[PDB]
Amino acid sequence: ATIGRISTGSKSLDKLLGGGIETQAITEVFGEFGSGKTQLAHTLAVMVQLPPEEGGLNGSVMWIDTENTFRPERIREIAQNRGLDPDEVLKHIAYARAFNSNHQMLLVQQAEDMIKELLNTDRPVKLLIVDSLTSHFRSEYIGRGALAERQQKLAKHLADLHRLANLYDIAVFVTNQVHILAHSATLRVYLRKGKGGKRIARLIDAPHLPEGEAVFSITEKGIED
């Protein structure tokens, strides 16, 4: 099946990404606090709902938080400022907070049920966000010999996410806060602050990257150049 591509809101970042974030893939964005990760997640949750000539997939969204990150009013702001109905955009986002890493795993199973339900409607799920994907795994699996079990559990969780991406033609978008540990995303994007309030993105280990860095801002429209 053809790969779909969701615009980030930034033409610079879209170009770096080859047109947008891909369905049938896990894209990981990582960086320090304040680097733009959560703002990119909120923007994507709006952009994916647009028609394709506006960079979207006419898609619904599922969002798993590990920390308290999701802000429905920020969604409303981004939508309103892009010419959309803010409250209609909220109706196409399903949100859950993971209590711990085991609950996080169950939530992915439940996500599959909604994905199946919507698959052959005109607003199938096209974006699954997992914010701070490793945060519970890092707090729970700690101490001597914890590395092996933590990374094994993570690998399984990531395999479950890859399966949903590939089986249902969804973009999976995950964030993490700052090797040598394993990583299993399709594409890894490093974000950092730049001058003038900008953010800078770089692809990590993607030799089929035409080399470069993207520059973008965080505004009332979410992410833009």
Partner: peptide
């Protein structure tokens, strides 16, 4: 809150 909810309902719940 133990499971998914639509974001419009979530906004209302948190208020």
């Amino acid at each position: 809150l133990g499971t998914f909810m639509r974001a419009d309902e979530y906004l209302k719940k948190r208020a």
